[PDB]
Design an enzyme around this catalytic site. Sequence first.
Site, PDB file in Angstrom:
ATOM      1  N   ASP A  94      27.078  -0.578 -13.029  1.00 15.94           N
ATOM      2  CA  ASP A  94      26.273  -0.001 -11.945  1.00 15.94           C
ATOM      3  C   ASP A  94      26.742  -0.544 -10.595  1.00 15.94           C
ATOM      4  O   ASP A  94      26.046  -1.329  -9.931  1.00 15.94           O
ATOM      5  CB  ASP A  94      24.769  -0.210 -12.174  1.00 15.94           C
ATOM      6  CG  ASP A  94      23.873   0.642 -11.292  1.00 15.94           C
ATOM      7  OD1 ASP A  94      24.338   1.681 -10.809  1.00 15.94           O
ATOM      8  OD2 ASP A  94      22.694   0.273 -11.108  1.00 15.94           O
TER       9      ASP A  94
ATOM     10  N   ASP B   9      -9.290  -4.495  -0.143  1.00 12.12           N
ATOM     11  CA  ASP B   9      -8.109  -5.038   0.512  1.00 12.12           C
ATOM     12  C   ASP B   9      -8.380  -5.706   1.869  1.00 12.12           C
ATOM     13  O   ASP B   9      -8.010  -6.857   2.027  1.00 12.12           O
ATOM     14  CB  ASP B   9      -7.026  -3.981   0.642  1.00 12.12           C
ATOM     15  CG  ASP B   9      -5.810  -4.467   1.402  1.00 12.12           C
ATOM     16  OD1 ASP B   9      -5.009  -5.209   0.817  1.00 12.12           O
ATOM     17  OD2 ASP B   9      -5.668  -4.109   2.587  1.00 12.12           O
TER      18      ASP B   9
ATOM     19  N   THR C  61       0.772  -1.260   0.000  1.00 11.79           N
ATOM     20  CA  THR C  61       0.000   0.000   0.000  1.00 11.79           C
ATOM     21  C   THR C  61       0.801   1.308   0.000  1.00 11.79           C
ATOM     22  O   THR C  61       0.649   2.102  -0.926  1.00 11.79           O
ATOM     23  CB  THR C  61      -0.941  -0.035   1.192  1.00 11.79           C
ATOM     24  OG1 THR C  61      -1.779  -1.155   0.966  1.00 11.79           O
ATOM     25  CG2 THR C  61      -1.769   1.246   1.358  1.00 11.79           C
TER      26      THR C  61
ATOM     27  N   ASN D 103      27.355   1.215  -7.805  1.00 11.17           N
ATOM     28  CA  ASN D 103      26.615   1.811  -6.679  1.00 11.17           C
ATOM     29  C   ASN D 103      25.121   1.415  -6.658  1.00 11.17           C
ATOM     30  O   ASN D 103      24.371   1.903  -5.807  1.00 11.17           O
ATOM     31  CB  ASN D 103      26.779   3.336  -6.685  1.00 11.17           C
ATOM     32  CG  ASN D 103      26.371   3.990  -7.971  1.00 11.17           C
ATOM     33  OD1 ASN D 103      25.967   3.338  -8.932  1.00 11.17           O
ATOM     34  ND2 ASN D 103      26.472   5.300  -8.028  1.00 11.17           N
TER      35      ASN D 103
HETATM   36  C1  LIG Z   1      -6.598   3.248   6.201  1.00 10.17           C
HETATM   37  C2  LIG Z   1      -5.324   2.915   5.484  1.00 10.17           C
HETATM   38  O1  LIG Z   1      -5.118   1.745   5.178  1.00 10.17           O
HETATM   39  N1  LIG Z   1      -4.480   4.007   5.230  1.00 10.17           N
HETATM   40  C3  LIG Z   1      -3.296   3.874   4.403  1.00 10.17           C
HETATM   41  C4  LIG Z   1      -3.439   4.597   3.066  1.00 10.17           C
HETATM   42  C5  LIG Z   1      -4.298   5.831   3.119  1.00 10.17           C
HETATM   43  N2  LIG Z   1      -4.381   6.585   2.009  1.00 10.17           N
HETATM   44  C6  LIG Z   1      -5.154   7.687   2.043  1.00 10.17           C
HETATM   45  N3  LIG Z   1      -5.302   8.543   0.926  1.00 10.17           N
HETATM   46  C7  LIG Z   1      -4.689   8.114  -0.323  1.00 10.17           C
HETATM   47  C8  LIG Z   1      -3.239   8.590  -0.473  1.00 10.17           C
HETATM   48  C9  LIG Z   1      -3.165   8.784  -1.943  1.00 10.17           C
HETATM   49  C10 LIG Z   1      -2.017   8.884  -2.705  1.00 10.17           C
HETATM   50  C11 LIG Z   1      -2.142   9.004  -4.074  1.00 10.17           C
HETATM   51  C12 LIG Z   1      -3.400   9.049  -4.648  1.00 10.17           C
HETATM   52  C13 LIG Z   1      -4.553   8.951  -3.889  1.00 10.17           C
HETATM   53  C14 LIG Z   1      -4.407   8.801  -2.524  1.00 10.17           C
HETATM   54  C15 LIG Z   1      -5.494   8.644  -1.518  1.00 10.17           C
HETATM   55  N4  LIG Z   1      -5.827   8.096   3.131  1.00 10.17           N
HETATM   56  C16 LIG Z   1      -5.716   7.332   4.221  1.00 10.17           C
HETATM   57  C17 LIG Z   1      -4.973   6.179   4.270  1.00 10.17           C
HETATM   58  C18 LIG Z   1      -4.891   5.367   5.520  1.00 10.17           C
HETATM   59 ZN   LIG Z   2      -2.974  -1.456  -0.434  1.00 13.59          ZN
HETATM   60 ZN   LIG Z   3      25.398   3.715 -10.996  1.00 11.83          ZN
HETATM   61 ZN   LIG Z   4      -3.353  -5.327   2.141  1.00  4.52          ZN
END
Ligand SMILES: CC(=O)N1CCc2nc(NC3Cc4ccccc4C3)ncc2C1
Ligand SMILES: [Zn+2]
Ligand SMILES: [Zn+2]
Ligand SMILES: [Zn+2]
Length: 779
Positions: free
Chosen positions: A659, A260, A158, A661
């Site tokens: 590569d 999920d 995630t 590094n």
């Molecule tokens: C409850 C839980 O599992 N989490 C982990 C991921 C998360 N993500 C978002 N927004 C996302 C962040 C993001 C990044 C890029 C595009 C869209 C979004 C919405 N808001 C809350 C949470 C909490």
């Molecule tokens: Zn996820």
């Molecule tokens: Zn390199």
């Molecule tokens: Zn998961």
Amino acid sequence: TNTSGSCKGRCFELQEVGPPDCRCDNLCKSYSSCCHDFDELCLKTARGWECTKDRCGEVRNEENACHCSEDCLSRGDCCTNYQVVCKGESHWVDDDCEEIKVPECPAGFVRPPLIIFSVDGFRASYMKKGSKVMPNIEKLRSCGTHAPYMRPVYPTKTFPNLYTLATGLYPESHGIVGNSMYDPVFDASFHLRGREKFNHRWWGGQPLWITATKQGVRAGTFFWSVSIPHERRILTILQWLSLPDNERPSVYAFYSEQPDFSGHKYGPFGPEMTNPLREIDKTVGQLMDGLKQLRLHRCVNVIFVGDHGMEDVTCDRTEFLSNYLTNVDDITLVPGTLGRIRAKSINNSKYDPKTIIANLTCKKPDQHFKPYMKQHLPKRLHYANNRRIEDIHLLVDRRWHVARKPLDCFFQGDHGFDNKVNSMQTVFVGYGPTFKYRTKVPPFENIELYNVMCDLLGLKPAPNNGTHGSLNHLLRTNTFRPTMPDEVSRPNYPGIMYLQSEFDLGCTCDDKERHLLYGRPAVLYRTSYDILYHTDFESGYSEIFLMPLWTSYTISKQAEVSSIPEHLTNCVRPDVRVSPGFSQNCLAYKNDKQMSYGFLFPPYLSSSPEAKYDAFLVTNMVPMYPAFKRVWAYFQRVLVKKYASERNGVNVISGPIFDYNYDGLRDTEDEIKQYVEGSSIPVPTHYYSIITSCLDFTQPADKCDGPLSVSSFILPHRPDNDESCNSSEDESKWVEELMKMHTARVRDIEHLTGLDFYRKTSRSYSEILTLKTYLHTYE
Ligand SMILES: CC(=O)N1CCc2nc(NC3Cc4ccccc4C3)ncc2C1
Ligand SMILES: [Zn+2]
Ligand SMILES: [Zn+2]
Ligand SMILES: [Zn+2]
Ligand SMILES: *[C@@H]1O[C@H](CO)[C@@H](O[C@@H]2O[C@H](CO)[C@@H](O[C@@H]3O[C@H](CO[C@H]4O[C@H](CO[C@H]5O[C@H](CO)[C@@H](O)[C@H](O)[C@@H]5O[C@H]5O[C@H](CO)[C@@H](O)[C@H](O)[C@@H]5O)[C@@H](O)[C@H](O[C@H]5O[C@H](CO)[C@@H](O)[C@H](O)[C@@H]5O[C@H]5O[C@H](CO)[C@@H](O)[C@H](O)[C@@H]5O)[C@@H]4O)[C@@H](O)[C@H](O[C@H]4O[C@H](CO)[C@@H](O)[C@H](O)[C@@H]4O)[C@@H]3O)[C@H](O)[C@H]2NC(C)=O)[C@H](O)[C@H]1NC(C)=O
Ligand SMILES: *[C@@H]1O[C@H](CO)[C@@H](O)[C@H](O)[C@H]1NC(C)=O
Ligand SMILES: [Cl-]
């Protein structure tokens, strides 16, 4: 930290307020900074989220979660089904698809807003398999622009994926390398639950909401507090969309923890999965009905995107390190669908990473993981250049888990495996005025979306890992016009300038339009190099590296494979076009008891016995470990002809990569850490090949009209074949499998070599960028 302030007329405000003043935004709960009356004022739940006949034309009541009163539209707080229940309108999903030829925005709007609708663990196959219970998602997909699948980044977790989506960067670059992390410099640990994740020191690069704000484009909230119901998140987005021109954000994001959360418990296709899918679809319907009643359903660009997929993983399918290792309590393990091994900190001087690797290498016939030192991981993963990434890595087989001991059922599903695995693939749907109508596009990587999102919002993207213009075929308009990079170094075209007698290289030999189809590669760094022509191939010879940077040759469907004659086995001929001082020597290889050599153009594919002598030129020679020669010789002798015969000829571009590094970028001569014994001859860390042919296989590769087809690899140049558990057997049983694991994009080879390919084709540059980002998965 004065909590005594009020949230009155400040519910989900967009301006962030610092201390002492208390916050009323969605992130206030996560940072424990809300005003005393936040939950009471801002999080109402009375009478639910839907209008009923009886509530139509009601007197406004502050206590309700959403309203069904005649002033609700102007106030931007109706329940999303208001016009349907009260004003006899139809649900968005019930309307036929009408092409959005131009944005139909209300007066005052500068540009069409972007709504990123993100769903966790939404596997690619749910689109087809769940279509009957997801009509709103099906309408978005069918009438907008969709890919059959979107490839996530490794690890297919995630936090690394959502943060890749926001920045266009690989996890190793943005810093979120896992859901659990340990930074040795901070001496702190990042976790899914905890207050450490809220520290800004962990989050690198520039996310979209920062890119927007720094360019005067207002950004709504991306991260939502878990306690905010999905219905409230949707209503908050709609309310923000109702704000006056000068306050209204242009970019929004919604997030759903589902499918999920249920996927982990019931597995990807568990009968219990239908309800979460129906729920996500209902939320889409709410957003779409909500936009329709605000007259924005033909003005807003909607992105329905996932972060990763979900595989069938049970605890019966667990591999234990206690079955391989003696010191399991003396190691820390990040377990599951991937493995990261670290030593336990205090009084553990006997800890040896080499012993852990050797004891995890090919021990059980049906072993369900493979150990790697992070710099030996397939290059396509881009998972090495970060201190938060432990040296010892375990690539776990799909459907399997790794744990330390039987000590450490409940779950039926999981994710985190290699990003090329089918079950790990996710979704992409683009719907709105800037996306195409009823269009299917080929699969692509999520690193690419950040540039598209900037383009949809008229922003200049921060430097990222996407290839800007590779996704233009998704858009109706607002396309970025890409330009080829300027060539830094012009080549020299040497003639015969040296005499055979001038060469004391310790070498002996019993010697007494067609091959460059897409123009010469452009060298994008400062260097000295020569273009060498031959009957069967062409090369770009580096004076500094003393070997070709690239070798190009075409093999037709009918090419004949010959063997290296017995009398030419150890033949190495001087090249009268290149100085002895800018040439390699045979004495260095005789004196290096661990290093042998190979050839970039294969002698096995020479057009005639006379032409075969050009393949033995000192300028076609490259250093190779004997173990790697087993891989390279099989590729050259067997696999190039196999591909030519299957693809109606192939054009091959091969060369070395350095590569040291492991940052995924071309090394400067000062970064090279290994040379052939007592020489200036640098040792490549990898070898590449770019194999091109016609997409229309009825056409030979050297006479192709229309799109091109490519497959590439970046082979690790290893002194042993421990990676391949069957490497004791004949090469026909293991070499091809190795190569498939080390499949690469042309773009990955470009970063590692500083070369620019496909400069002279009859194709549009946008199309060539799409070709360069292509990964052949064998999946
Ligand atoms: C409850 C839980 O599992 N989490 C982990 C991921 C998360 N993500 C978002 N927004 C996302 C962040 C993001 C990044 C890029 C595009 C869209 C979004 C919405 N808001 C809350 C949470 C909490
Ligand atoms: Zn996820
Ligand atoms: Zn390199
Ligand atoms: Zn998961
Ligand atoms: C994927 O794409 C990536 C992005 O292009 C590629 O990664 C880049 O690689 C190059 C080369 O390795 C590297 O460049 C070096 O930068 C050195 C300084 O580094 C720090 O600053 C940059 C830039 O900061 C700006 O941007 C951020 C937001 O992104 C912002 O917060 C800053 O305030 C600052 O703002 C300014 O620019 C923005 C636009 O970007 C404007 O909006 C703004 O107004 C300002 O003008 C940071 O990105 C760096 O971040 C790294 O380090 C921090 C702290 O540790 C991490 O949190 C973060 O995740 C990131 O870590 C990763 O990269 C480092 C290496 O930088 C790794 O060690 C690590 O393991 C991670 O992978 C830094 O804070 C500079 O000194 C240096 O100069 C050298 O070369 C020049 C010649 O040009 C010589 O003259 C010098 O002598 C030096 O030898 C060089 O320019 C980029 O920093 C790096 N960017 C990122 C994001 O990683 C990546 O290669 C590519 N992958 C592949 C395979 O192609
Ligand atoms: C590795 O295996 C050998 C032989 O089984 C054993 O003696 C040794 O202790 C093991 N080492 C570790 C660190 O597991
Ligand atoms: Cl993790």
